[PDB]
Design a protein around this ligand. Structure first.
Ligand SMILES: *[C@@H]1O[C@H](CO)[C@@H](O)[C@H](O)[C@H]1NC(C)=O
Ligand SMILES: *[C@@H]1O[C@H](CO)[C@@H](O)[C@H](O)[C@H]1NC(C)=O
Ligand SMILES: *[C@@H]1O[C@H](CO)[C@@H](O)[C@H](O)[C@H]1NC(C)=O
Ligand SMILES: *[C@@H]1O[C@H](CO)[C@@H](O)[C@H](O)[C@H]1NC(C)=O
Ligand SMILES: *[C@@H]1O[C@H](CO)[C@@H](O)[C@H](O)[C@H]1NC(C)=O
Ligand SMILES: *[C@@H]1O[C@H](CO)[C@@H](O)[C@H](O)[C@H]1NC(C)=O
Lengths: 55, 240, 150, 111, 332
């Protein structure tokens, strides 16, 4: 098991304030099997892809 | 009269008790007030009473938690084991769980019988104190009270009994010259009944074992003997 | 006698060895509600063995009869008549860092009077004032009648 | 999975059934044009920490909010703290059953 | 985590959710130790209920008076007796019983400093079955007994109802029927009879005396119980082996859980039976301690008209001397 803490990166854009960080991925072999899970954010909302597709 | 007669067995004479009965009355009242106000603190009586109550509650709670233990099975609830598993293949699987609960109950009742037997022995000691120190009094040392015991009242307590061992404790002492044993020059000994012999201005007087009070020599405080020993204070003019 | 291994003998060097079990014991740690540190005490051990087998010394410590105690200054001369953290053999520890002291539950009532008899008389402290005190005692006579069904 | 935008502890998100034993984890690099911008923007501070089978003493308030937790394995203090289920245990001697001894491994017995 | 399973990870990991079945064992063991040290404290309290010693009391110098030998009942020297702990009689009693508090701490201390493996205490103490020393060492109890014995004769008298030892035996023997006319003229005979009784008592431990029989029986019973408990770990219990390394190494870590569950619950129920028997034995010891305290404050300190209680026959006096794991009485 693991534990990861993320510090918000308050980056300022022209008249807009956003915050984006890295993307975390978990797996065992990273092939068309093992049920890989990728968790990535898109400007304030998390998107999780639990599909076991190739990379 | 009971406290006055019982306090004589320790050594103090009635010459002081008869003139200080009000002191005994106020001492008893103060003792009862101290006993009644003693439960507010961490008294030993409430400690063992709450220990017995909490021990019974802890035993019942531990027994109830035994039903929630897995015992090597998949779960502890009966509905899950008889619903998820088939009614035909779960018999041998539930047999170990049911005999485990039965042996746990057997161990609990065995410990309960042992504890109840200990309770019976304690009750025997309690009845012995009730009919030995409360109702009457016998010459036993350090039994009805850790010290100079006088009386012992009884009051009901939650799951047991409570006793008021009215002891006898002194406050101030006094240095004095004592002399156990004495004998007349006519080849006859003298022994103190309950106390010692104290010389006081060329005169031999007897005092109690727990109260310095020089009283004259009489027959109720002298154990007569037939011949004098060797390590006795030789002193004439002490004829009775 | 029981049937356990206690030694062996190598077949390549013709050497014999005696197997001795190594340290796998516990450690006693006394704690007080008003304190912050802990008084670690290794029962039946030497300070050199603990230092060469656990870690380096970082707290004040000294040897003792029971073992090597940590974070507790030893003071055998001091005596207390009431202790709450008893360690054994009449040794107690208490927060002032804890201090290793000795405890005696009851002491005899010493007097300044002579022992021998001078002129055929002795010296005994007899009372002059008395106050009837009241003691307490609870004897468990009845117990809760518990019942369990089949 | 558990995430928390506000507060110290974290809440529940979901649970699945995979069966396959997980073995790795990675951090995808960012082909981003503006990350530092000549030391004028926030950089990356991604940290990870491994876990193990341990036990704590979680204290819940009147509103069910975690305030203090005992490690139970950091030192002997944590063991005495979580031995009596109290942040400030009572006085007395505490025999720590389960003291670390750090032994060696023994395998492949020979006849 | 020591006697239940060795210092491994597979056994300790399974003992997390299943660890609640050993908390009651630890609690009952702590309760047993509580009864033991509370009874020991009560015995130490009843041995000095009303003692009153003197500050100018030289135990090493003044220890004999009125033609009666008290050398074996005195065991301290100087103001602080640190070098001297027990008396001569206690030394003779503890010489034949080496498994005392000092013997246990010596056997446990000389386990890693370098010696020869010839005792089972090292294998017992390294498997979690240790014997902690009592809260009061044998030296403290010996000093308490010595103080009581000395206070019974030197003024002020405490354990002799406020009367000298010679006067106590002379007044007590009158209750049997003999008058003081014979006792007053034969005090030397009583003194030499007491000296001969003490000599016969001291020299009686060399043979198969009843005191050493029960003392060694108690020590051997405790050692046998600990050995039998340790042998339970070596029992197969229906498994292929008894060692944890073999079961967690030869068998797979996934299919051995259900197989090791029966072995672990068997060891736990064996431990539960052992602590139950220990609680029963400790309760019996508590009752015996109650009888011992009754004799201490009923026949040693004072005397009451009871028949065949303080001695099988015409009892006169009853001295007290410390013994390994108990007390010893001299029913004169
Ligand atoms: C895995 O899926 C990809 C799809 O892009 C495919 O090209 C590849 O051949 C697959 N792997 C195997 C071993 O067939
Ligand atoms: C008490 O008796 C002993 C022996 O009979 C004797 O030596 C001693 O002098 C006596 N004590 C006194 C004060 O005479
Ligand atoms: C070891 O002892 C055996 C037994 O006598 C002997 O034959 C042998 O030469 C010794 N040395 C070695 C290296 O085996
Ligand atoms: C602990 O400290 C508090 C601080 O006021 C004090 O009131 C209390 O008596 C202390 N208790 C002990 C046991 O030292
Ligand atoms: C600690 O104990 C030793 C004896 O074991 C003693 O010599 C030493 O003085 C003690 N330390 C003190 C009193 O600071
Ligand atoms: C005895 O002590 C009590 C304690 O309060 C005191 O009130 C009383 O006056 C004393 N007796 C005498 C005779 O002074």
């Amino acid at each position: 098991g693991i534990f990861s803490r993320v510090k918000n990166t308050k980056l300022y854009v022209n008249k807009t304030l956003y915050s984006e960080f890295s993307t975390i991925v978990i797996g065992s072999v990273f092939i068309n099997n093992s049920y890989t899970i990728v968790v990535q954010p898109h400007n304030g909302v998390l998107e999780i892809t639990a599909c076991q597709y190739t990379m | 009269l009971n406290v006055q007669y019982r306090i004589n067995g320790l050594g103090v004479t009635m010459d002081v008790l008869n003139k200080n009965q009000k002191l005994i009355a106020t001492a008893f009242n103060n003792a009862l007030l101290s006993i009644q106000n003693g439960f507010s603190a961490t008294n030993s009586a409430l400690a063992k009473i709450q220990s017995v109550v909490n021990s019974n509650a802890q035993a019942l709670n531990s027994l109830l938690q035994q039903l929630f233990n897995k015992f090597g099975a998949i779960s502890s609830s009966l509905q899950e084991i008889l619903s998820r598993l088939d009614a035909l293949e779960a018999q041998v699987q539930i047999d170990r769980l049911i005999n485990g609960r039965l042996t746990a109950l057997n161990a609990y009742v065995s410990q309960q019988l042992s504890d109840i037997s200990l309770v019976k022995l304690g009750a025997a000691l309690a009845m012995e104190k009730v009919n030995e120190c409360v109702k009457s009094q016998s010459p036993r040392i350090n039994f009805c009270g850790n010290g100079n015991h006088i009386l012992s009242l009884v009051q009901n307590a939650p799951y047991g009994l409570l006793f008021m061992h009215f002891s006898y404790k002194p406050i101030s002492f006094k240095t004095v010259l004592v002399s156990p044993g004495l004998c007349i020059s006519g080849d006859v000994g003298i022994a103190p009944k309950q106390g010692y012999f104290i010389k006081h201005n060329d005169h031999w007087m007897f005092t109690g074992s727990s109260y310095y009070y020089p009283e004259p020599i009489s027959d109720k405080n002298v154990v007569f003997m037939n011949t004098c020993s060797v390590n006795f204070t030789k002193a004439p003019l002490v004829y009775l | 006698f029981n049937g356990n291994i206690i030694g062996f003998k190598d077949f390549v060097t013709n050497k014999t060895y005696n197997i001795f079990p190594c340290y796998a014991g516990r450690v006693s740690a006394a704690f007080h509600q008003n304190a912050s540190s802990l008084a670690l005490l290794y029962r039946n051990l030497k300070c050199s063995y603990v230092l060469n087998n656990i870690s380096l010394a970082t707290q004040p410590y000294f040897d003792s009869y029971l073992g090597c105690v940590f974070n507790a200054d030893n003071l055998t001369d001091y005596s207390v008549s009431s202790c709450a953290l008893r360690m054994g053999s009449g040794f107690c520890v208490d927060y002032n860092s804890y201090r290793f002291v000795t405890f005696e539950p009851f002491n005899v009532s010493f007097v300044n009077d002579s022992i021998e008899s001078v002129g055929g008389l002795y010296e005994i402290k007899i009372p002059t004032n008395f106050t009837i005190v009241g003691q307490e005692e609870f004897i468990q006579t009845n117990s809760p009648k518990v019942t369990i069904d089949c | 999975a558990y995430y928390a935008d506000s507060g110290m502890p974290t809440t529940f998100l979901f649970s699945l059934y995979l069966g396959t034993l997980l073995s790795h984890y990675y951090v995808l690099p960012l082909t981003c044009n503006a990350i530092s911008s000549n030391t004028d923007n926030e950089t990356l501070q991604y940290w990870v920490t491994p876990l193990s089978k341990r036990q704590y003493l979680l204290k819940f308030d009147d509103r069910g909010v975690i305030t203090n937790a005992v490690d139970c394995s950091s030192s002997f203090f944590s063991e005495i703290q979580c031995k009596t289920k109290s942040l400030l245990p009572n006085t007395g001697v505490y025999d720590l059953s389960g003291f670390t001894v750090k032994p060696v491994a023994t395998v492949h017995r020979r006849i | 985590s020591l006697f239940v399973c060795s210092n491994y990870a597979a056994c300790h990991d399974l003992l997390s959710e299943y660890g609640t079945f050993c908390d009651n064992i630890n609690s009952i063991l702590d309760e047993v130790n509580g009864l033991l040290d509370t009874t020991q404290l009560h015995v130490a309290d009843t041995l000095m209920q009303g003692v009153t010693l003197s500050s100018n009391l030289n135990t090493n110098l003044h220890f004999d008076v009125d033609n009666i030998n008290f050398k074996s009942l005195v065991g301290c020297l100087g103001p602080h007796c640190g070098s001297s702990s027990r008396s001569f009689f206690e030394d003779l009693l503890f010489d034949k019983v080496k498994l005392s508090d000092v013997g246990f701490v010596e056997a446990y201390n000389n386990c890693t400093g370098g010696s020869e493996i010839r005792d089972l205490l090292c294998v017992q103490s390294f498997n979690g079955i240790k014997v902690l020393p009592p809260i009061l060492s044998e030296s403290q109890i010996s000093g308490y007994t010595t103080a009581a014995t000395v206070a019974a004769m030197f003024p002020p008298w405490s354990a002799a109802a406020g009367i000298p030892f010679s006067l106590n035996v002379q007044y007590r023997i009158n209750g049997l029927g003999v008058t003081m006319d014979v006792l007053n003229k034969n005090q030397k005979l009583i003194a030499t009879a007491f000296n001969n009784a003490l000599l016969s008592i001291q020299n009686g431990f060399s043979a198969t005396n009843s005191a050493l029989a029960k003392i060694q029986s108690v020590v051997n019973s405790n050692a046998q119980a600990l050995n039998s408990l340790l042998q339970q770990l070596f029992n197969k219990f229906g498994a292929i082996s008894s060692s944890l390394q073999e079961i967690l190494s030869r068998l797979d870590a996934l299919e051995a859980q259900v197989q090791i569950d029966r072995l672990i619950n068997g060891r736990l129920t064996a431990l539960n039976a052992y602590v139950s028997q220990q609680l029963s034995d400790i309760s019996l010891v508590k009752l015996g301690a109650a009888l011992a305290m009754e004799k201490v404050n009923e026949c040693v300190k004072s005397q009451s008209p009871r028949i065949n209680f303080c001695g099988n026959g015409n009892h006169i006096l009853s001295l007290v001397q410390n013994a390994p794991y108990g007390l010893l009485f001299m029913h004169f």
